[PDB]
Amino acid sequence: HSSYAHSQSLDRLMNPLIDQYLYYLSRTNTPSGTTTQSRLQFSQAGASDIRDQSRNWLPGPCYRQQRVSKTSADNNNSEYSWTGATKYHLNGRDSLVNPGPAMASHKDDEEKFFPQSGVLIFGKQGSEKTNVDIEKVMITDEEEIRTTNPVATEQYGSVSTNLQRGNRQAATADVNTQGVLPGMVWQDRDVYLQGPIWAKIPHTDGHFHP
């Protein structure tokens, strides 16, 4: 079991001092004084444009949860518990995933937010069986796998939808479910002092990363 955090993120694995020898999407027009003329320019990225030098590896798979606040004021005044759930569907009946795939609970400096059914929630001493408040529970945290796993309450990415030409624009999408692609690395879910130790792998024909 990986009992280490990562001291580096997946998108920061390179030398800032040295540029790359590859070229990327720098600019697709020119400021020509008044108009543009679509020159299709290309650049290198070492430091100043560090987001679009890219590499051999991708973040792990996703399955998007809702975002629920610790603060009761920043949550909705509706019954979005089951209606806003993640609910995998099997043999004509739905079932909450709880917690589902291992993803980060939240992004940088948003600690009051947690995925709706993506985090193990233990209890305090003497907490009742049903309908206990937010101070009677202990929500765990998966903020150490922000380096390789996506944030559970957010998108994986934004793939393209159209084929751009001279009249219409390029339109993207919102990748909310991403299956495993080649080149993905990820971390499993953290183990806890009061969480489980093992589980039986079901005797099936197919199973991936058990």
């Binding site: 400021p31 008044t34 108009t35 009249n167 219409r168 624009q169 339109a171």
Partner: peptide, 14 residues
């Protein structure tokens, strides 16, 4: 860019 000239029919900018 601060100048984003658009012609009809495609009325969608970023």
């Amino acid at each position: 860019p601060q100048f984003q000239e658009i012609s009809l029919p495609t009325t969608s900018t970023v």
